[PDB]
């Protein structure tokens, strides 16, 4: 029971995509927090060398002027999923002129994820976190290679996701201002994951219902560094 | 198993099947493109050894792509035949589109590219044929090229593949000549290397097949050497070795 | 592995065939059903001294066999 | 070995399945084809398992064209599918070029189809060795093709069971200036050497290409050559 | 294990040993008998029913092949459903093309062709079901054909499939099945089904009767045993 | 084998017979030699001769003998083989057909070997660790060196390579004379013609041809051999009587 | 479940075949690209003209655009294939799109081609990595690297191949954060890197320069030896 | 031995296709013999109708078929394969009549069936049909012909050689019957066939236990002999 | 096992153990319960929780004004089947303005699930589905399994720990037949309660409801809708 997803184990589990979850594990982490003020995503670059352009690693992306994305796992498959999410938003908006619900974006990307043994390749070894706003609420969602997705208020994916997830669970509540949730995320990432914060290997992206511009955080981390 | 399918790398990244194709070429009949100026030649001795062999074409190793293009054959027989037909087809496409002769490097790259494409896809066996090209074009004129099963191609002024290919290129690098080394000296050196590589004492005329391209009238001619010219060429080389003996 | 092992079996057999020392009077005889097979390396004359055929008994020979047993 | 799959190479560079096909060849029906000064003679045996088998019901020498005769190594059904393909290919050439197909070119196309069957991972080659006699531009041609897709020209050759004896026979029992009658005599003599058991009009069949046309021998002529002669 | 892995490679000994697993699969399912009476064919099928969580007539094993063609199956139920759809397709194709009713022999041979073709391809497997088709053409008579997972189509005056093929056939053999009329045949079928392990070890089950016949106007119908339940009384009287 | 015997004489005999130069030069002595060539080309014969002349003991263990049916046995057998090597002190170690374990290994499937490689790396450690390299050397033979791998060949390991090509005209003459020295020849024998009529001889097949001529003499109860006997013995030892028509020019050219 | 394939994962999730492609790239020769203040320079080594061989035919540096150039290191057959694809893509993009080609778009195209070639059964991945240098970064120089995993990144200066471990550290040793004034200085640094050639001779290094506005520029061996001499004079200063 | 027999499109080291030999091991189909005889004006085929159970309708149990008013067929093999081969023959004959305007000859029909078996033998897509086949037909002023076609993909249609469980005894009996010179009438031909069946099977041969098809130049319409004719022949040979 | 890799190979047992492993894949999912009355058809699903701050996964799906489903299995296959029901309901309404009868839809689902079970190199959809519907013929509750067998059932429960709920449903089978909507939904809630361990009881977090009726369209009830349903129901004593 090793050739592919088309084989069922005696316990029913398909012995192909558990390795896809393990492929989620080998990737660098990503954190997402859902707050009433705004939905935020934090991401570690795992930068090999400073000669690298840090922005060249697209582990934090802008799906649309109302939704951003982070993810863990394989970067190429992640980029393909991001490309589909962007073209889906473009097509749906250009046709219906209504804003794409972030949950609908997750649905479309998941429906693509169901294209390895469901038609006529292999599971997309990457898990995604979406943070967006819409006319009915600001939301954060998570999805995995299996094509399932879930609404989360505070989610961690990738390597060492357990400890970061435990800290995120312990610090989170339903009435946090986005500033306090952001700061808790930064201090947690600092203590558990690698080191003190710096613009070279960490990235942040926030979304607010009334802000379709500057979906990222860039060239302003300075005020954080002295006051973290 | 890694070596069973062409699309699987070794853990070191090497591909076993194309390597097996080259070790196959190791069995191929000795054949070389010799070092020549104002002309070129593609000598290819025939491994066919039996009395009742008719050799009615009088050529089974060197195939003329056009009056300005000739190619050698060293590999699987049927693969070589289909590949030569594909060479003629591709040259026909280029000529029919442009009404101009195809350059040497462009045709060589096209064949090597389709070979690589065939080796790349699964369920398909790599073409176990390496070959040589002798040609003249507008851009570079006289050119001799070597190509392998993987789709790799390169330019060589004098090269040999097949049986004792390493030894052949070794003594070619040994008594290497350059510049004033014209076509006739190329025939002499080809005769020398063929007598050295082959185990036959007093190498027989029918055992060897030689062709050469020369720019006549600017329209060029490719002549495959008949029995008589090979005969006095080999006889002259024998008396040349006798002359080398006379020095002692 | 079975194929490699049978090849080593054949090679060891040939090595022992050429390797049994002089002044040892061992004889080695092999039976076969087809004999159109069998590696010519084993059929090499340096270690094969005679090849004897045993075809199906025809007339006369069948008569002799029947008489002998009966 | 590397024979269960057709589309892979062995470490030594051999594709073992096709020499397995060649081993199926030369285990089949013995047959001998020689080229005389004027014509080309191909002879093959007709000996079945039981006397019930009406052998005239199954010819083995088949005229591809009025100027082409064809014989196989013994793989019957594969020979039949290949001979159907060869006949259709000869017809295509005859209509496209408005001229009869050259013997060498016909063998080239047949071997090209043969090579086409020497690839993929779900097919097998026809383990048949093909002897083709023909007349082209006043010249006689004898060619041999093999399941590997290769083809060659022979003044004289043989394949099938006990083929090495036929090779030695045509080595010493041949000269290129043989007349047609003496060519058929040489063919039946090497058939006698290669075959086991006597022959009559029933047991052999022969096709001869002459520059005017090709024709397969009637069994009566086959007995005339084989019996009361040699 | 030999070469008994796919139904396209001819295993040691002419027996494939692959379809002879489909016969074992058919052996697993409960019995189902059928009797050709004077004017019609009666299909009596027992379906084991766990009364727990049931729907008193769910997933019934009687299906309509054609307005006149009835059928019974034993073996895998999903294969039975799919091949019932296939038989309906074939009957509709004949009806549309030829402009009149399909003979049962031709329908049976085409369904057997479908089964036999599915037995062969490597990428597919033979059906794990054996079935029995009945019809009545008022023009010439009644037709009946039983086809196995291998695709063998043979006629029976009376036949059976399932877990008690030989026992049910022995029970049928002493029926005066030459001449009587389907009405008493319904009771005969019911008591024959009940006599072969009605509920001896298995807790509960349900009996379904299909009927094609001249007195039934020649179309395919489910016997309305709700009237006086005479066959049910006979089957339970078969207690001793 | 004069060229081959001179190279091997240097590489093996010079250290054992004259260690002082290596002590004078400071460099450690070379450890072992690999031999490659067609089968029957006197590789084992030459190794045995070197063992005899350098007065060192001869120990032979074939690579086919190394495999065994159990894990943990090839390692044990190789290590104890070198235990006999050390306890016999001045000696030479022969691994005939080391390519049997110096071969391609199964790269996954329904099974695997994993033990041929293990015996290889054990031998590789033993000769790499230059275990008591005082008057002890190793020698191995491989048919068709191409199948062998470079794992044993890596620089600090076995140092020298030797080629054993098929005997040429003069070599065939020498082998014929050597093996027919015991034979009862007759005037009119012209061994040069027989040597010419045997192109591409394998050396051992020359021993085959003289044995065949003797067998022809024996089956006629003659204790003497003639030119005709060798001439018809060539007809049987030519070894292409089963060849020249397995379709070689075709599908391989 | 070990690798044995391209479309299955090891139990820990790694795809071993892309790693094997990475190793196949590691077998290839050195290739070190940089971008300077305004110009981009490239130098390829280990030409090893085999006497009878003429070096020019292999074309270790190939230009497929109005302005873009570098070969792909690894197996040169895949290099020629992707060369043909890059020619087709650049010409088609220039003919079809309202504006000409940019380096980012062609880099993404190559990465997507490699990914789509990897993402299937029975399709051997392109085991070749490359270093792309382009001119139209809004009239600025920039450098990308392409990895057989179907991945692309944007370097200030990168090295791939046999010296990937070494020269990168060399880069990390002296890639000046001051933008290289007199980009000839960056070319001299590239020559110093090429002194770390597989043969280390430096007499057969093939070099290209493009000033982000110019077309392809090729450096002859004598003028490249001039920069080698300047680098040697700088090195002799330690006295 | 194992390995060259797991798949059809693989040759053995001796060149033997194992699977074609395997397919012959179901042609046995214990119960059928299919003796075919040719006489100076007739062609007869007879098979051993071994009915295993009483409840089956004997009409459906038949194993002889017809697709041509002047061509008769008898099969010996697995029943579903037999009926599929019969349907394929019907398809081919219907195509031939629709195309050429006249019905397919017996020789051409058996050749087409054998070619179908051949193309399924050469390609691993499908299992070859496991059943042997015999036609009887008439060729214009040329006579009666009996033809055999087997899963080997080849045909020899000759004189007899019944492809049933009693292979060698029946074949030798037919040889011995033809090995002695004698006339050949329809009654004599059917007598030869029935004597062969009786001597190779040694059963009492009740009329319902066998089924006979026949063609004759006197009336070229292929017919199945009635049980009355079968019993008349049985009593004629019994006395 | 030699004969257990794919659905195309038969076991000597007269079985295909790949289909059985699909059944195990189904029972790996959490429990879902379905029950119908002469008035309404109701289904309830145990929504598995992922964390104390993540949404409990939806297990009741809704595609028709009169048909709904509850899934137990791989979400991929279940949602593909849900999109399939979307397609069929839509073209049926397009063809003859008829809300598709649930029985024929379930038969089509079984037929389309049978195809993977007979073809090599294609996994069967390893999900079990409970279907609730109301049509011109009556109320209806079905189940569909990867063995492509479809069943009609008054009461039913699939997934992990389903046996206690199945026994409870058997016991109250004598009740459902004339039970009203509230009684039926409360009995379904208690049936789902039967599956849970002692410490786990019915809560709006893990409970999802889906109801179709002769006078009401099929609708799904969740936290804010489930909360009125749970209040007033008997608690769980020890
Ligand atoms: N050049 C030679 N001179 C004398 N005898 C030879 C020569 N070559 C081969 N032989 C004989 O042939 C045999 C080859 O045996 P061996 O050395 O084991 O061959 P290999 O080393 O190839 O296995 C030896 O017994 C030897 O007597
Ligand atoms: Mg030796």
Residue numbers in the entry:
A (entry chain K): 8 to 127, 134 to 241
B (entry chain I): 4 to 251
C (entry chain D): 280 to 349
D (entry chain H): 5 to 234
E (entry chain M): 5 to 244
F (entry chain C): 154 to 406
G (entry chain J): 2 to 240
H (entry chain G): 6 to 244
The authors write:
The 26S proteasome unfolds and degrades hundreds of proteins to maintain proteostasis, regulate cellular processes and generate peptides with second messenger functions. It consists of a 20S core particle (CP) capped by one or two 19S regulatory particles (RPs) that gate access to the CP proteolytic chamber. The redox-active thioredoxin (TRX)-like protein TXNL1 is expressed in many cell types and was proposed as a nearly stoichiometric component of the human 26S proteasome. It uses its C-terminal PITH (proteasome-interacting TRX) domain for binding, while potentially reducing disulfide bonds with its N-terminal TRX domain but how it binds and is regulated remained unclear.
PSRpt4 was not previously observed in structural studies of the substrate-bound yeast or human 26S proteasomes. On the basis of the locally refined map, we could reliably determine that only two subunits, Rpt4 and Rpt5, are ATP bound while the other four Rpt subunits are bound to ADP. This is a strong deviation from conventional models of always having 4–5 ATP-bound and 1–2 ADP-bound or empty subunits and again suggests that ATP hydrolysis can occur further upward in the spiral staircase and ahead of the large movements and nucleotide exchange of the substrate-disengaged seam subunit. We refer to these PSs based on the highest substrate-engaged Rpt subunit in the staircase as PSRpt1, PSRpt5, PSRpt4, PSRpt3, PSRpt6 and PSRpt2, represented by ~19,300, ~112,200, ~29,500, ~32,200, ~24,200 and ~73,100 particles, respectively. They all show typical characteristics of the substrate-engaged proteasome, with a shifted and rotated lid subcomplex, the Rpt4/Rpt5 coiled coil positioned near Rpn10, a coaxial alignment of the ATPase ring with the open-gated 20S CP and the substrate polypeptide threaded through the central channel. By contrast, in PS proteasomes, the PITH domain gains high affinity through additional interactions of its C-terminal tail with Rpn11’s catalytic groove and a coordination of the active-site Zn+. The preceding PSRpt5 is the most abundant and likely most long-lived conformation of the hexamer and its transition to PSRpt4 is linked to two ATP hydrolysis events, suggesting that the movement, nucleotide exchange and substrate engagement of Rpt4 are slow steps during substrate processing.
